Amino acid sequence: PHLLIDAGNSRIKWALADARRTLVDTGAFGHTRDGGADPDWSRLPRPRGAWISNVAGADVAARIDALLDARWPGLPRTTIRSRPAQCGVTNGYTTPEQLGSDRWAGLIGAHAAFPGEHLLIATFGTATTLEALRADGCFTGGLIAPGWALMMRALGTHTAQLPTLTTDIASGLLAGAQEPFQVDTPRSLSAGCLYAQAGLIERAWRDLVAAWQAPVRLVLAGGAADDVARALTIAHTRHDTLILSGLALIAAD
Amino acid sequence: SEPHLLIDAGNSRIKWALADARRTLVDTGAFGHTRDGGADPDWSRLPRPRGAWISNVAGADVAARIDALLDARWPGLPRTTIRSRPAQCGVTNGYTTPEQLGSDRWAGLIGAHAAFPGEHLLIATFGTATTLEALRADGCFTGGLIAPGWALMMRALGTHTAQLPTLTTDIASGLLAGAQAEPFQVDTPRSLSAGCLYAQAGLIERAWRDLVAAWQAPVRLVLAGGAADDVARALTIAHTRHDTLILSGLALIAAD
Ligand SMILES: Nc1ncnc2c1ncn2[C@@H]1O[C@H](COP(=O)(O)O)[C@@H](O)[C@H]1O
Ligand SMILES: CC(C)(CO)[C@@H](O)C(=O)NCCC(=O)O
Ligand SMILES: CC(C)(CO)[C@@H](O)C(=O)NCCC(=O)O
Structure with a gap:
């Protein structure tokens, strides 16, 4: 207990x-x-x-x-x-x-x-963290980046013309859009930050696979994992x- | 005159x-x-x-x-x-x-x-924000995307987390220079530096490959801005620098 x-x-x-x-x-x-x-x-x-x-x-x-x-x-x-x-x-x-x-x-x-x-562990919170974990238990290293929400929030507060979008709003925007390239501001912003997440993870995973010359399972955790997973072109596993x-x-x- | x-x-x-x-x-x-x-x-x-x-x-x-x-x-x-x-x-x-x-x-x-x-063209411009634009040879700007810049990403991490410090690009670049940079890092400032940088490079490489696949034609990647130098090193794909x-x-x- x-x-x-x-x-x-x-x-x-x-x-x-x-x-x-x-x-x-x-x-x-x-x-x-x-x-x-x-x-x-x-x-x-x-x-x-x-x-x-x-x-x-x-x-x-x-x-x-x-x-x-x-x-x-x-x-x-x-x-x-x-x-x-x-x-x-x-x-x-x-x-x-x-x-x-x-x-x-x-x-x-x-x-x-x-x-x-x-394993490659991708956790989506305030920050997006990545960890490389070998089967024998060796945590060999990692990466830290701002999360989806934080990226867009940062854009909204540190520029004069960009709106501040929530993940709820951003997620709905991408649903109605047809791809990283957009033809309006809130969708460009939403997609830009999302593909920064997907691009980061995908690059890291291929780097980890090439380094360990062995299969690596990509594990996703966090609320933003839903939206990030939809942009991934590589296999992934959810575990929250x-x-x-x-x-x-x-x-x- | x-x-x-x-x-x-x-x-x-x-x-x-x-x-x-x-x-x-x-x-x-x-x-x-x-x-x-x-x-x-x-x-x-x-x-x-x-x-x-x-x-x-x-x-x-x-x-x-x-x-x-x-x-x-x-x-x-x-x-x-x-x-x-x-x-x-x-x-x-x-x-x-x-x-x-x-x-x-x-x-x-x-x-x-x-x-x-x-x-x-795919135009990558590095300022406060990182902006991408897809440009056809005929002049059609077909679309783009907006992401926070390298400095802004790390500043955001520094201000919105209790245990992460704010790193400048000078500090980050100094810590990632040479053999220091790895796919994964074993300390906080470099993990922070690399993570945001690889997010920049990762974004660009993903968008570029998608664009080439979409248009099914040659696409020149063009880099502009201050942070372009650091991002360029992280890139595995070719690029043109034009500020x-x-x-x-x-x-x-x-x-x-
Ligand atoms: N991209 C542009 N190229 C040339 N002239 C412009 C441009 N944008 C605005 N102007 C001129 O700036 C003045 C005010 O623009 P506006 O406030 O948009 O009416 C007018 O004389 C416009 O013709
Ligand atoms: C994206 C920035 C901040 C880059 O300077 C600037 O181009 C801007 O304010 N753009 C307005 C929104 C848009 O271009 O879609
Ligand atoms: C990176 C965060 C903010 C993500 O929760 C947290 O794990 C943290 O404060 N880490 C300390 C620095 C580090 O893990 O290298």
């Missing part, structure tokens, strides 16, 4: 896993700066403890603590950090702790979910619980 | 050129915005132009600053601010609403049409 928390820069994801690490309850809530509400932990049993992954800063760390203290007073909690090696995975970062804890947990989750496979599954394994050990 | 002053004002820098004949760029330069502590252009050695032709995508404040700079240096100088048209100088605007196309992209399209006669596209377009407009 462990509570797991995946705090990112855009929102805070949580889950409750039993003895068999089955995520019996899941949920998500936004940050206070974005008018985010609190999580509904009313119909939730008292966990033995809480395991936290937080890359969203000290204020979020404090808020999470307050939430736990309000619901379950004095609940045991642990904030995880990236380790040189853990749960079958080795950290290839020159300075292992520098790696985002969410990326670390996701690696641990992916290692278990796809045993005996080389890698981070929370990893936290379960970390909590279990 | 009368020279033309050409202004290309973007969201990051304001580029200018003094032009002779049809499109001969005699003097050139650039300067930053007031909000960035940018200085004023050195026009102290320039003769009085016949007029100024301006492309501005950076708003009314910048437009007012440019007018003020011109009024101070050359009082009474005629000025023209350009807007994207349905068709001009051999180029046909494929935009649903032609006027919505960035005037800098329009001028650049006009310059590319003249600079590469008889060729199908004066926009200023040449303005010159051709001013000559006509």
Whole structure:
């Protein structure tokens, strides 16, 4: 009975896993700066403890603590950090702790979910992160880029004439369009940023395949994966619980 | 005998050129915005132009600053601010609403049409944003796309994440120089630098291959802007470097 928390820069994801690490309850809530509400932990049993992954800063760390203290007073909690090696995975970062804890947990989750496979993990959040993971557990390196939403948001705030589009709006725009090349501003913007994601991933995957001279499964995770997958001309696999599954394994050990 | 002053004002820098004949760029330069502590252009050695032709995508404040700079240096100088048209100088605007196309992209399209006669083009321009335009040999601008630039991508990561710092292109380029650059990185600043850069290159390569496959004909990739050098290294496909596209377009407009 462990509570797991995946705090990112855009929102805070949580889950409750039993003895068999089955995520019996899941949920998500936004940050206070974005008018985010609190999580509904009313119909939730008292966990033995809480395991936290937080890359969203000290204020979020404090808020999470307050939430736990309000619901379950004095609940045991642990904030995880990236380790040189853990749960079958080795950290290839020159300075292992520098790696985002969410990326670390996701690696641990992916290692278990796809045993005996080389992987390219594409996670779509505030940032788009890529990780190369060998079957033997070796995390050999990665890439970091802004996510689809962030790219368009950046265009809207740092130019005078470009509109600020949400992924909801952007996704609908591309649905009615017929290809990277568009004949209007919001579609050019939406397609330009989307194919920056697809182009990044596709180039990385072919680079990884050519480097390891072996099959590599491309794993996609995150809400934006839906829209990015539709532009991909290479095979891909969806798996949206890698981070929370990893936290379960970390909590279990 | 009368020279033309050409202004290309973007969201990051304001580029200018003094032009002779049809499109001969005699003097050139650039300067930053007031909000960035940018200085004023050195026009102290320039003769009085016949007029100024301006492309501005950076708003009314910048437009007012440019007018003020011109009024101070050359009082009474005629000025023209350009807007994207349905068709001009051999180029046909494929935009649903032609006027919505960035005037800098329009001028650049006009310059590319003249600079590469008889060729199908993919134009990659690197500024605050990275913009692509597909241009037919006959002059048909059939479509394009807009993505954030290399610097903007990293700035966005720096401001909207708690644990990532902001890297400049100078810092990123220095960290990725030589054997430092890899398909994947093992530290945060290089992973950040490479990820955004490979997003640039990846975007261009994807759009280029799709265009060639679509038109089923040769397509010349043309690069313009400051970040082009770094992006070029990341490219595995061939490319042509041609930075004066926009200023040449303005010159051709001013000559006509
Ligand atoms: N792309 C262009 N090329 C040449 N002249 C232009 C262009 N855009 C605008 N102008 C001129 O600028 C003035 C004002 O333009 P507008 O505000 O669009 O009516 C008019 O004299 C137009 O003919
Ligand atoms: C890159 C993000 C913001 C993506 O969530 C996060 O994983 C993070 O803060 N990482 C720290 C820097 C690094 O992973 O190299
Ligand atoms: C895309 C930028 C910002 C590049 O300078 C500029 O060309 C612009 O403001 N364009 C307006 C929208 C469009 O060109 O479709």
